[PDB]
Design an enzyme around this catalytic site. Sequence first.
Site, PDB file in Angstrom:
ATOM      1  N   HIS A  68       0.518  -1.193   0.238  1.00  0.00           N
ATOM      2  CA  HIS A  68       0.092   0.308   0.295  1.00  0.00           C
ATOM      3  C   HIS A  68       1.045   1.319  -0.192  1.00  0.00           C
ATOM      4  O   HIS A  68       0.680   2.187   0.587  1.00  0.00           O
ATOM      5  CB  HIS A  68      -1.001  -0.231   1.371  1.00  0.00           C
ATOM      6  N   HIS A  72       1.478   1.358  -5.738  1.00  0.00           N
ATOM      7  CA  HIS A  72       0.247   1.407  -5.754  1.00  0.00           C
ATOM      8  C   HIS A  72      -0.226   2.778  -6.019  1.00  0.00           C
ATOM      9  O   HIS A  72      -1.420   1.784  -6.742  1.00  0.00           O
ATOM     10  CB  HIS A  72      -0.138   0.408  -4.801  1.00  0.00           C
ATOM     11  N   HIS A 106      -5.790   7.209  -3.173  1.00  0.00           N
ATOM     12  CA  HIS A 106      -6.831   6.707  -2.421  1.00  0.00           C
ATOM     13  C   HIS A 106      -6.551   5.560  -0.917  1.00  0.00           C
ATOM     14  O   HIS A 106      -7.600   5.410  -0.827  1.00  0.00           O
ATOM     15  CB  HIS A 106      -7.256   6.019  -3.784  1.00  0.00           C
ATOM     16  N   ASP A 107      -5.373   5.709  -1.010  1.00  0.00           N
ATOM     17  CA  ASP A 107      -4.708   4.589  -0.260  1.00  0.00           C
ATOM     18  C   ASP A 107      -3.715   5.474   0.759  1.00  0.00           C
ATOM     19  O   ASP A 107      -2.413   5.280   1.353  1.00  0.00           O
ATOM     20  CB  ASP A 107      -3.930   3.536  -0.862  1.00  0.00           C
ATOM     21  N   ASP A 217      -8.363  -0.941  -7.837  1.00  0.00           N
ATOM     22  CA  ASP A 217      -7.475  -1.330  -6.805  1.00  0.00           C
ATOM     23  C   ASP A 217      -7.019  -2.745  -7.359  1.00  0.00           C
ATOM     24  O   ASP A 217      -6.130  -2.857  -6.318  1.00  0.00           O
ATOM     25  CB  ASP A 217      -8.602  -0.662  -6.122  1.00  0.00           C
ATOM     26  N   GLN A 269      -6.350 -17.499  -3.496  1.00  0.00           N
ATOM     27  CA  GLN A 269      -5.903 -16.667  -4.268  1.00  0.00           C
ATOM     28  C   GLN A 269      -7.658 -16.956  -5.093  1.00  0.00           C
ATOM     29  O   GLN A 269      -8.204 -16.183  -5.672  1.00  0.00           O
ATOM     30  CB  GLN A 269      -4.923 -16.900  -5.020  1.00  0.00           C
TER      31      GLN A 269
END
Length: 313
Positions: A68, A72, A106-107, A217, A269
Site C-alpha cells: 500500500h 500502488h 486513494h490509499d 484497485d 487466490q
Amino acid sequence: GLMQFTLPVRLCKEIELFHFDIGPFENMWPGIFVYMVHRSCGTSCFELEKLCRFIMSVKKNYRRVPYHNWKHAVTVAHCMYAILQNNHTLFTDLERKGLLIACLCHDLDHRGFSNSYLQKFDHPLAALYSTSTMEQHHFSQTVSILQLEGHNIFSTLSSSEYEQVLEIIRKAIIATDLALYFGNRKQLEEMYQTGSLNLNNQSHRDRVIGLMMTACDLCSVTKLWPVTKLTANDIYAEFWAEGDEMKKLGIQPIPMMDRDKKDEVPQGQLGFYNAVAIPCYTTLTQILPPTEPLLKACRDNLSQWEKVIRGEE
Ligand SMILES: CN(CCF)C(=O)c1cnn(C)c1C(=O)Nc1ccn2nc(-c3ccccc3)nc2c1
Ligand SMILES: [Mg+2]
Ligand SMILES: [Zn+2]
C-alpha cells in the site's frame, strides 16, 4: 503551455494497454502520472507548477510499506487512465479530472493494516470513523494536501464545480472499501440485467465509478503473470505482518493473515478470483464493453493459480 510530457517509445505505446507495469524506476512515476493527466484530461486541466507540487506532497504522504505504497497509487491511476481512454465519450470533464486524482490519493498514509486491525487495536482512527476507517482517512488526507499553499490544482474551478469534484473524489475513495463492493456490484448486476441502468441517473454513475475504483484497485490480477505473482508476495507480506500483530493482541488471525498457513495461498487466490476479481471485471465489462481485456487477463491469471495448485508451477 506548449510543454508536452513524452515517454520513451516502449512506454508511450505500452502505457495505453490495461496490463502496463509502471516499472521499478520510482523517479519516472510522477512523469508517468502527468503524461496520463495531459492525455486523459488535457494539458490545461491543471497548472503544471501546482500539479507537480501536489504529486510530490501526495508521494511524501505514502509510507514505505510493502504493498500500500506510492507504486500502488500510480498503478491504480494507470488502470483508471486506460479505462477512461477506452471509454472517452462516457465521462464528464470533471470526472476525467477527479478520478485520476482520486486514484493517486486513494490509499494516502496507509500503514499496511486492514480496517479490522485498526478496530481491534482500538486505533484513534477507529473512533473518528466507525466504517470505511482507512478510506475516510485517505479522503481526509486528500483534502489536507489540497489546502496546502500552492497545492490547489482545482483553483480554476467554480465554487460548484469544485464541490462536485471533491464529492466525486470522496465517493471514488470510499468505494475502494471492499466491504462496500459486494453490495455495489449486486445492485449493478440487477440494474444492467433488468435494463433499468441509467447513466443520466447520478446515483447510477456513482455505483459505476465505484465499480471502476474496485477494478483499478484490484488491477494486479490483470497484469502479466510474473507481475501478478510478485505483487502477491508484497500483498501477503502485509497480511502476514497484520497476522503477527493479531497474534500479539491475543487473537488467532484469519488464515489469509497467518504466515503458518502459506501452503494454502494458491487456493486463497482461487477464492478471491472467483468471489471478487472475476465478478468485478464481468459486471464492469457488461457496462463498459471496451474494459474486456481486464476480464480476459484476470481469467488468464486465475488459470495460472490453478496451474500452481496442480504442481505445474
Ligand atoms: C489488497 N487487498 C485487500 C486490502 F488490504 C486484496 O484483497 C487484494 C488485492 N489484490 N489482490 C490479489 C488481493 C488479494 O490477494 N486478496 C486476497 C483475498 C482473500 N484471500 N484469502 C487468502 C487465503 C485464505 C486462506 C489461506 C491462505 C490464503 N488469500 C487471499 C488474498
Ligand atoms: Mg485502500
Ligand atoms: Zn488501494
